[PDB]
C-alpha cells in the first residue's frame, strides 16, 4: 500500500553551503571542504548564541526507518569507529567495511512553493541506522503493540530500572560449614586420630560472633579485611516523619535572554511648542525596535514537592507489597516473582505514597511494618561491601576469612603438628546477598574459588622462657577452659497460616543450670534449612535473621503463658497483675 515516510528532525549546525557533496564546513585554500559523513555534522554542535538568527545552510543527523523507536532517555549505541560515530558499517564483498550513512536534503515550505529554477536545499540531514538498545531503563507506558515505527509508537514513555546490589555478606556469613553434622570441621592431633570439634544443629556459630562483636565494639565503623561493614537501613525510610514542604516562596524558570515575547516599536520625538506634538524618527534609529511591554515571560516550579515525591516513590513506594501493585500493559513480565524482571516492572500508583500520607505524624507505613527494611538500596553496609568488590559484574577477588567458632578461636596452641580441615559453601543464595532477595541461581550469578592459604601469626618467644611456660602449661591443673557468648541451644518451631495460638511442650527433665528463655519470630522464606547442605527450594538471598540478627517480627506477639508440669505456674506467687501470663500488648487500655 501507499504509506508515506514522515520525518521528525532537528538541524542545529550552520554550515557555509549545501551541494550534492554534503554540507560545506570549511576551505582547503581554494577548494571547499565538506562534512565527513562517518561522524560529522556532530550531535553536540550547534548555535553558540542565545538570540534569534536566520539560518540558510543547516545540518544534523537522524535515525533511519529500519531503526526501532526508543525513548531518548536511556538510549545507547556503541561507537563503530574511533571518531565517535555510531552508525553501522557493512562488510562488503571485497572484504572492506563500508558506510551506511545516507544524506537527505530538504527545503522550506515557501521554497517548495515555487517551480524549482532557483531551488537549493536549506537543510541537509545525515540519516543513519545505529544499533540502539536500552541498558538501564524500561517502558512505563507502551501505547501500542503495532509492528514497526509509527506516530502512535512515539507516545512511549520511559522509567529507569530499579537498583539491585549483590555482594559478599557481613563477616562472610555462611561461607563456612558450621552446625551441620556430615560437613563438620576438623581439628585434630597428628599423633592421635580424634577430633577436637564437636558440632550440631542446636549450635548458632554466626550469631554468637555477631552479638559478641556488638558487646565488644562499635559496628558503625566499617573495616574491609573481615568485611565488617554491618548491615543497616536509613531511619527516615523505615519511619516517615511527614512535616510538609519548605516551598513558602514562588520559584521560577526564565527565557535564555531573560525577556522574550517582544513587540516592534518605532521611535517618536516631541515637537517642543505643542502640548501633545509628535514627529516620527526613522533616521539614525531603527523603525523596528524590539521591546517587551510589561514583565518578561516566565514558568513556575515547586522544588520541594517534586523532591519529596521522588524521594518517597524511589525509596518506599517501589518496595510496597505485591497486593498493592499491577502488571504494565503492552509489556511482558516473568511468571516466577522471584525474578528481577517482575520486581522491576510491577506498577504501584503514586497516590498511595504522595505528599499528604501520614502528614503531621511520625509513623512507619503499615504495609511496611511486616516488610524487612534491611533489604533496601540505601543499606550503607551492603552498598559498601558491593564497592569493595567493584562496580562490575566480573570480579577477580581476594578475601580474608576468620575462624568464628568460639572454642577454637580463643585457644593458645603448643608444640606439635595438627590436622586442621574445613568445608565451604558455593551456593550463591547463601554466600552472596542481594538487595531485593532475588533467586541468584536462576538469575545467573556464579562464584568459582581459585586457591586457598591458611595464615597463622606467631610470637617468636625466647627458648628458655618458652620452655618454662610450656613446662608450666603442660601440668594437670592448668588445662584451658572456654565457653560460648551465646551459650544456648537454638530451636525453630513452625507456625501455620493465621495460627494465633502457639503451644509447645518439653518432656520431663532436670532444670539446674538454666539461665532463662529468649525468643523471636522469623519467616520460613528467610530461613535456610538446618543440616540441608544445599537447598534448591530456598529461593531468598536477603539478610538472614537466624545468622545476622536482624529480627523484626517481635511486635507480632500478644502475650506469653509459662506452665511447669500440670498447673505449676512460673514466676507465680501473685507477682504481676496477670499472675500466670505476661501480657505484652493490649488494644485500648482503660485500666
Amino acid at each position, epitope marked *: 500500500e501507499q504509506q508515506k515516510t514522515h520525518v521528525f528532525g532537528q538541524a542545529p549546525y550552520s554550515g557555509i553551503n549545501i*551541494t*550534492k*557533496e554534503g554540507i*560545506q564546513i570549511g*576551505v582547503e*585554500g*581554494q*577548494t*571547499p*571542504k*565538506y562534512a565527513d559523513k562517518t561522524f560529522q555534522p556532530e550531535p553536540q554542535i550547534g548555535e553558540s548564541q542565545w538570540y534569534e538568527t536566520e539560518i540558510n545552510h543547516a545540518a544534523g543527523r537522524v535515525l533511519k526507518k529500519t531503526t526501532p523507536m526508543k525513548p531518548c532517555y536511556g538510549s545507547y549505541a556503541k561507537p563503530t569507529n574511533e571518531n565517535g560515530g555510531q552508525g553501522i558499517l557493512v562488510k562488503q564483498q571485497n572484504g572492506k567495511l563500508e558506510s551506511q550513512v545516507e544524506m537527505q536534503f530538504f527545503s522550506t515550505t515557501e521554497a517548495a512553493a515555487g517551480n524549482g529554477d532557483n531551488l537549493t536545499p536549506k537543510v541537509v540531514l545525515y540519516s543513519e541506522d545505529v544499533d540502539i538498545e536500552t541498558p538501564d531503563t524500561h517502558i512505563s507506558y507502551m501505547p501500542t503493540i503495532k509492528e514497526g515505527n509509527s506516530r502512535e509508537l512515539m507516545g512511549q514513555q520511559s522509567m529507569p530500572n530499579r537498583p539491585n546490589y549483590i555482594a559478599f555478606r557481613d563477616n562472610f556469613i555462611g561461607l563456612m560449614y558450621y552446625n551441620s553434622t556430615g560437613n563438620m570441621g576438623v581439628l585434630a592431633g597428628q599423633a592421635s586420630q580424634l577430633n577436637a570439634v564437636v558440632d550440631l544443629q542446636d549450635r548458632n556459630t554466626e550469631l554468637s560472633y555477631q552479638l559478641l562483636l556488638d558487646s565488644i565494639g562499635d559496628r558503625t565503623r566499617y573495616f574491609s579485611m573481615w568485611n565488617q561493614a554491618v548491615d543497616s537501613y536509613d531511619p527516615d525510610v523505615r519511619i516517615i516523619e511527614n512535616h510538609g514542604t519548605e516551598d513558602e516562596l514562588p520559584n521560577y524558570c526564565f527565557p535564555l535572554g531573560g525577556v522574550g515575547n517582544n513587540s516592534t516599536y518605532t521611535k517618536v520625538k516631541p515637537k517642543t511648542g505643542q502640548e501633545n506634538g509628535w514627529e516620527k524618527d526613522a533616521t539614525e534609529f531603527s523603525d523596528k525596535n524590539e521591546i517587551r511591554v510589561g514583565n518578561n515571560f516566565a514558568m513556575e516550579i515547586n522544588l520541594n514537592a517534586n523532591l519529596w515525591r521522588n524521594f518517597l516513590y524511589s525509596n518506599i513506594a517501589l518496595y510496597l507489597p505485591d497486593k498493592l501493585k499491577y502488571s504494565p500493559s503492552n509489556v511482558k513480565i516473568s511468571d516466577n516473582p522471584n525474578t528481577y524482571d517482575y520486581m522491576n516492572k510491577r506498577v504501584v500508583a503514586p497516590g498511595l505514597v504522595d505528599c499528604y500520607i501520614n502528614l503531621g505524624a511520625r509513623w512507619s507505613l503499615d504495609y511496611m511494618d511486616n516488610v524487612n527494611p534491611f533489604n533496601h538500596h540505601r543499606n550503607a553496609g551492603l552498598r559498601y561491601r558491593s564497592m569493595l568488590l567493584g562496580n562490575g559484574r566480573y570480579v577477580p577477588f581476594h578475601i580474608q576469612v576468620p575462624q568464628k567458632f568460639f572454642a577454637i578461636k580463643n585457644l593458645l596452641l603448643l608444640p606439635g603438628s595438627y590436622t586442621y580441615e574445613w568445608n565451604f559453601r558455593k551456593d550463591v543464595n547463601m554466600v552472596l546477598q542481594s538487595s531485593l532477595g532475588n533467586d541468584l541461581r536462576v538469575d545467573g550469578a556464579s562464584i568459582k574459588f581459585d586457591s586457598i592459604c591458611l595464615y597463622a601469626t606467631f610470637f617468636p618467644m625466647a627458648h628458655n622462657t618458652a620452655s618454662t611456660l610450656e613446662a608450666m602449661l603442660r601440668n594437670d591443673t592448668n588445662d584451658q577452659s572456654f565457653n560460648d557468648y551465646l551459650s544456648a541451644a537454638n530451636m525453630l518451631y513452625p507456625i501455620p497460616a493465621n495460627a494465633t495460638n502457639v503451644p509447645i511442650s518439653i518432656p520431663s527433665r532436670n532444670w539446674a543450670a538454666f539461665r532463662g528463655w529468649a525468643f523471636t519470630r522469623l519467616k520460613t522464606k528467610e530461613t535456610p534449612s538446618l543440616g540441608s547442605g544445599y537447598d534448591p527450594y530456598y529461593t531468598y538471598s536477603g539478610s538472614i535473621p537466624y545468622l545476622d540478627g536482624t529480627f523484626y517480627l517481635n511486635h507480632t506477639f500478644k502475650k506469653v503463658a509459662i506452665t511447669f508440669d500440670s498447673s505449676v505456674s512460673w514466676p507465680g506467687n501473685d507477682r504481676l497483675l496477670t499472675p500466670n501470663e505476661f501480657e505484652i500488648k493490649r488494644s485500648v487500655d482503660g485500666e
Partner: single-chain antibody, 227 residues
Framework: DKDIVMTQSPSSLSASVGDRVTITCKAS??????AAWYQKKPGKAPKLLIY???TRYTGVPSRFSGSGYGTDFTLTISSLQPEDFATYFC?????????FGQGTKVEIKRQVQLVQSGAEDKKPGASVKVSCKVS????????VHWVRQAPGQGLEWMGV???????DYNAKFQGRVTITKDDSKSTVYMELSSLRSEDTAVYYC???????????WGQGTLVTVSS
C-alpha cells in the same frame, strides 16, 4: 544513475541553404525537461546550442530552436545557413554516467581558457598522463569534466572531479581512469592506465555552467595506441 541510450534520428541528413531541417532525439528512459543539443565541427570541439529542452546558450544564433518532454526531444533549424554543415549531438545530464548519442551527420545535397598537453602514442597496457591548464576560473568554484571522441564513434563521458575533489568515473573503464589536480598551478591531470587500441581517441577537458551543461572545452589531446 544508470546508462540512458540517446538515439538520434535521422542518422544522416542532406541540405542546401535556406532549408528547414528537423532532427529528433529519443531517450530510452526519461530525462524529463533535461535534453541538451550540441553542434560539433569534425575537427573542433563541441559547442552548446540548447539546454533544458528549449534554451539557447550565450551568443548561439537565432535559427536554432529546441522542443519536447520526457523521452522525445526535437532540434529545428528554422532556415539553414552555410555554417550548419556539421555533426550534431544529443546529450543528457540527468544521470551519472552522463550520456550522448552516436552523432548525426548533416551534409550538403550534391574570458575562460583551458589548454591541454600535446599529442602522443603508445603500446598496449602502457600508461598516459594528460594535463589541462585552467585560467579564467579557479578549480574550487567549479568541477572539471573529461570526455573523449573516437574517430568514427560518438562522445564517451569518461569522468569528472567535482569542485571539492570528489571524483566519479565511467564503469566501462574498470578503474583505469584516475583524475588529480593542483589548485595552485590551476591544472587538472587525467591519468589512464592499462591502454587498449580502443583507447585510440581525441581526449577533451570540459567545464559546465552553474546547473546546466558543458560550455567550456579544451583544444583536445590526441592519444593513439597501435600494435
Amino acid at each position: 544513475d544508470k546508462d540512458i541510450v540517446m538515439t538520434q534520428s535521422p542518422s544522416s541528413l542532406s541540405a542546401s541553404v535556406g532549408d528547414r531541417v528537423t532532427i529528433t532525439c529519443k531517450a530510452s528512459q526519461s530525462v524529463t525537461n533535461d535534453a541538451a543539443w550540441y553542434q560539433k565541427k569534425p575537427g573542433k570541439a563541441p559547442k552548446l546550442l540548447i539546454y533544458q529542452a528549449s534554451t539557447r546558450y550565450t551568443g548561439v544564433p537565432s535559427r536554432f530552436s529546441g522542443s519536447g518532454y520526457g523521452t522525445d526531444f526535437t532540434l529545428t533549424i528554422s532556415s539553414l545557413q552555410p555554417e550548419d554543415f556539421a555533426t550534431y549531438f544529443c546529450h543528457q545530464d540527468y544521470s551519472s554516467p552522463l550520456t550522448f548519442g552516436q552523432g548525426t551527420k548533416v551534409e550538403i545535397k550534391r574570458q575562460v581558457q583551458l589548454v591541454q598537453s600535446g599529442a602522443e602514442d603508445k603500446k598496449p597496457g602502457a600508461s598516459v598522463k594528460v594535463s589541462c591548464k585552467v585560467s579564467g576560473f579557479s578549480l574550487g568554484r567549479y568541477g572539471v569534466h573529461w570526455v573523449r571522441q573516437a574517430p568514427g564513434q560518438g562522445l564517451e563521458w569518461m569522468g569528472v572531479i567535482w569542485r571539492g575533489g570528489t571524483t566519479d568515473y565511467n564503469a566501462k573503464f574498470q578503474g583505469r581512469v584516475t583524475i588529480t589536480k593542483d589548485d595552485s598551478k590551476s591544472t587538472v591531470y587525467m591519468e589512464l592506465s592499462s591502454l587498449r587500441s580502443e583507447d585510440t581517441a581525441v581526449y577533451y577537458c570540459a567545464r559546465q555552467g552553474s546547473n546546466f551543461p558543458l560550455a567550456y572545452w579544451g583544444q583536445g589531446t590526441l592519444v593513439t595506441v597501435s600494435s
